[PDB]
Design a protein around this ligand. Structure first.
Ligand code: NAG
Ligand code: NAG
Ligand code: NAG
Ligand code: NAG
Ligand code: NAG
Ligand code: NAG
Ligand code: NAG
Ligand code: NAG
Lengths: 139, 327, 227
């Protein structure tokens, strides 16, 4: 290739063509509350579709402690990638640990790591009328 | 006459991270052992890149998040003859952006090149705030300006009709209140005409958003230069790390490998230094954008040529790819 | 002057709240600790990097000279010299960039001291949230702390308003303020505070007939005459 890395090789016996590719995919991020409160973590594989995560990690040849972070009931799919080790919630809070793409994570309540959509702000509405005004009376 | 002029300012750039061990020694155990002898050099670049990424998120947040409540867009886009429909989201169309923002998002083109970056440890992380969230912020700012005026910046929102707001804004530049009320419809027609001209100018192909494409181009060139520099042998017998280990002995192979290690380390150092300088420039631009949003959207400014050519009346923000556009 | 003592009590109360907030443990001064931490980490990294051998036989300079000859010892020493030179160059480049950032922050602090302590500023949110009144500087380790006092409007009320009134075919516009309807009659008030005044000839001015202004109401204007 342009990086002087060989990618395709011809078998000297069968004259077929084989593609060699790196056995290390892209980035892995670890989300931790801190090792002063607990010892569980969440794992984010970014730019990886979580349907086929086990192919990208080769979890068959890892430790059994690495297989419980490969699939389960705690699988979430965000625009960043696939997040394993956290529970999805529907309420929105202020951002604590920024995962990305609008998704934040925190350590809520026995405590567990939760992932949610960040809250932009408080919701308010003021009515527009063409013949009324609001004037302060105190300060 | 009433004139609407546009100003484009960059806010953030792309956040990138580099895996040092897989950039320098790709899947090589011997090169990994020789790399540990260079202690605490790969951990010094990740700290700098993490600082840059956190700075980018801070830039975007502390420019755009300036209101403490979110205002719903009104059902009526006609405030006393002034047509606000082009700069507010359209309920019937299922996009969460205004029309001018839709034009702005098409004039900047964000995109075996990305795959080679991915295979060598170069990764681009997504921004924390998505485009819909920034669109929500700008819609809240425009709605608050149309319905409340200058008061919501300094505290809670105080309702006022739009004509009386324009009367105060004419008082602020030295023209009495009656001049607005005598010929209000002429001013409304000029406002609508200038909005239409801005729309027409943005529609046609131009280079008005050239300052935003140059950020994207420079980051792409830097990352491609890192990918391309891996083919240099740096004075060694070859640039392939697996051919030096196939026909040489340990004492004579370590001497050849160390040259490649030093060359790739100093290439990656050049990249991180250039990124730090460019990040400083982007931070200065974002600080100016934040103070412009504070002093020209939440109020009226008497500084000369700070917010356009003429006497400033009021101003509107719009979102753009990695940037902001002030009208 | 009407309610000076209420303002004095609010000033003293806010000073006490600032004192109470600074007393308890917090991270309000976190921007000043991060300067100290970064410089310490950089200097410790320079100290720690002296143990790398940079591809030579050893990182100790006195062991290469105890078991090697001149031609073969200079080759090993030059690698250490180059590695330490480029480490020290990395340190000085990082220091230059950090110094530029600190200089920009200090320039902003100087202009803030000039425009908010020696005067009053009309720039929005330049010196706090609200309308700026006055400001005080305090010294901090490698930094400055500004206390801005601000006027915050409160307790809003609803009123019915009009752009102008006309008495006898002549439109009257307010000079400073707005026309409001308390429920009985029409008064003129300032925008920021509610203090109603009687519509009079001195605080209004006349412009044309009342057939072009959109939304004009009819009323009476007091004149200071008729003795
Ligand atoms: C051996 O190499 C030849 C190439 O000349 C190939 O045709 C053949 O299939 C290979 N294998 C055997 C078992 O002969
Ligand atoms: C994952 O794959 C599905 C189809 O197999 C596709 O629709 C989806 O966009 C993919 N996700 C990502 C993040 O690429
Ligand atoms: C403003 O509120 C305070 C509450 O502490 C009250 O004591 C004061 O009388 C109010 N101002 C007026 C003008 O009533
Ligand atoms: C506002 O402008 C749009 C086109 O930009 C137009 O369709 C709409 O009718 C206008 N609103 C009016 C005239 O009230
Ligand atoms: C003012 O009137 C509007 C509309 O009638 C109402 O929504 C709002 O709550 C009122 N505010 C006060 C302080 O009375
Ligand atoms: C204005 O209306 C308010 C409504 O409560 C009333 O209290 C006040 O006395 C009125 N002012 C007059 C009649 O001057
Ligand atoms: C205010 O709006 C109402 C309803 O749209 C209208 O009847 C009235 O004439 C308007 N008043 C003005 C424009 O002064
Ligand atoms: C005010 O009264 C006069 C009486 O001469 C009338 O001509 C005018 O239309 C009135 N204005 C209104 C009802 O807004």
């Amino acid at each position: 290739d342009v990086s002087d890395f060989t990618d395709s090789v011809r078998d000297p016996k069968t004259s077929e063509i084989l593609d060699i590719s790196p056995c290390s995919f892209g980035g892995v991020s670890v989300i931790t509350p801190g090792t002063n409160a607990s010892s569980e973590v969440a794992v984010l594989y970014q730019d990886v579709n979580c349907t086929d995560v086990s192919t990208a990690i080769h979890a068959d040849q890892l430790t059994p402690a690495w297989r419980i972070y490969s699939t389960g009931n705690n699988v979430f799919q965000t625009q960043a990638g696939c997040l394993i080790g956290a529970e999805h919630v529907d309420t929105s809070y202020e951002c604590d640990i920024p995962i990305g793409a609008g998704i934040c994570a925190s350590y809520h309540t026995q405590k567990s790591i939760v992932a949610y959509t960040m809250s932009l702000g408080a919701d308010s509405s003021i009515a527009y009328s063409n013949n009324t005004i609001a004037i302060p009376t105190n300060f | 006459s009433i004139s609407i002029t546009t100003e484009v300012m960059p806010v953030s750039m792309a956040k990138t991270s580099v895996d040092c061990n897989m950039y320098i020694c790709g899947d090589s155990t011997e090169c990994a052992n020789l790399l540990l002898q260079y202690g605490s050099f790969c951990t010094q670049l990740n700290r700098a890149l993490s600082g840059i990424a956190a700075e980018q998120d801070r830039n975007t947040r502390e420019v755009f998040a300036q209101v403490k409540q979110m205002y719903k867009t009104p059902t009526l886009k006609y405030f006393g003859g002034f047509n606000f429909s082009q700069i507010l989201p359209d309920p019937l169309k299922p996009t969460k952006r205004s029309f001018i923002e839709d034009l702005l998002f098409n004039k900047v083109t964000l995109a075996d090149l990305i795959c080679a970056q991915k295979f060598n440890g170069l990764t681009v992380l997504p921004p924390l705030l998505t485009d819909d969230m920034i669109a929500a912020y700008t819609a809240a700012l425009v709605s608050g300006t149309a319905t409340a005026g200058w008061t919501f910046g300094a505290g809670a929102a105080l309702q006022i009709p739009f004509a009386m707001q324009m009367a105060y804004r004419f008082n602020g530049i030295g023209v009495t209140q009656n001049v607005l009320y005598e010929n209000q419809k002429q001013i409304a027609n000029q406002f609508n005409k200038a909005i239409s001209q801005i729309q027409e100018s943005l529609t046609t192909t131009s280079t008005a958003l050239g300052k935003l494409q140059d950020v994207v181009n420079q980051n792409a060139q830097a990352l491609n230069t890192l990918v391309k520099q891996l083919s240099s042998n740096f004075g060694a017998i070859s640039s392939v790390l697996n051919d030096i280990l196939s026909r040489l002995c340990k004492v004579e192979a370590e001497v050849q490998i160390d040259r490649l290690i030093t060359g790739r380390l100093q290439s990656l150092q050049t990249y991180v230094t250039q990124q730090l300088i460019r990040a400083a420039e982007i931070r200065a631009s974002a600080n100016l954008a934040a103070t412009k949003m504070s002093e020209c959207v939440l109020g009226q400014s008497k500084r000369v040529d700070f917010c356009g050519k003429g006497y400033h009346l009021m101003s509107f923000p719009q979102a753009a790819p990695h940037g902001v556009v002030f009208l | 002057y009407e309610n000076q003592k209420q303002i004095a009590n609010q000033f003293n109360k806010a000073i006490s709240q600032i004192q109470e907030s600074l007393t308890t443990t917090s991270t309000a001064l976190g921007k000043l600790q991060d300067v100290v931490n970064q410089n310490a980490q950089a200097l410790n990294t320079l100290v720690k990097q002296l143990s790398s051998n940079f591809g030579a036989i050893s990182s100790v300079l006195n062991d290469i000279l105890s078991r090697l000859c001149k031609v073969e010892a200079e080759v090993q020493i030059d690698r250490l010299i180059t590695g330490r030179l480029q480490s020290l160059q990395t340190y000085v480049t990082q220091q230059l960039i950090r110094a530029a950032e600190i200089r920009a922050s200090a320039n902003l602090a100087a202009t803030k001291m000039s425009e908010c302590v020696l005067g009053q500023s009309k720039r929005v949110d330049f010196c706090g949230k609200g309308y700026h009144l006055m400001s005080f500087p305090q010294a901090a380790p490698h930094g400055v702390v500004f206390l801005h006092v601000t006027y915050v409007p409160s307790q809003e009320r609803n009123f019915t308003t009009a752009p102008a009134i006309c008495h006898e075919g002549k439109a009257y516009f307010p000079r400073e303020g707005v026309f409001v309807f308390n429920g009985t009659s029409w008064f003129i008030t300032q925008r920021n505070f509610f203090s109603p005044q009687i519509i009079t000839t001195d605080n209004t001015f006349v412009s044309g007939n009342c057939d072009v202004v959109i939304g004009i109401i009819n009323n009476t204007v007091y004149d200071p005459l008729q003795p």
